[PDB]
Model the fold of this input.
Amino acid sequence: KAQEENMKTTLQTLTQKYSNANSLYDNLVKVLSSTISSSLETAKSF
Amino acid sequence: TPWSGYLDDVSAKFDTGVDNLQTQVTEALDKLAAKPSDPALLAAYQSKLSEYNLYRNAQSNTVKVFKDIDAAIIQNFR
Done:
């Protein structure tokens, strides 16, 4: 059972890496500012 | 030979003052027609377009004011 709780905590670490991957991907998808914030440059063409 | 009065001379002086302003605007607008967001021509687009606008306004106002002076002189004969 000690070995099995070690396996279970390994699986818990891999699952909890949701907060390590999706959490930062949610604001990594904010590279779209390169589209929106570079679309307010219409002042260059008035 | 192509005749040119003083007002025509002033207009030609403005045309020869700018090298290829009409042409420069032409290629700037043509280049922007396919690359709308790109730098170094968008700013060039706005600068050349404003340059052309001020050029045309200056030419029109100068010929108008010289015409006003000349008309005053001609009318003042009598």
Observations:
- The longest helix of chain B spans residues 42-76.
- The two ends of chain B are 34 Å apart (CA to CA).
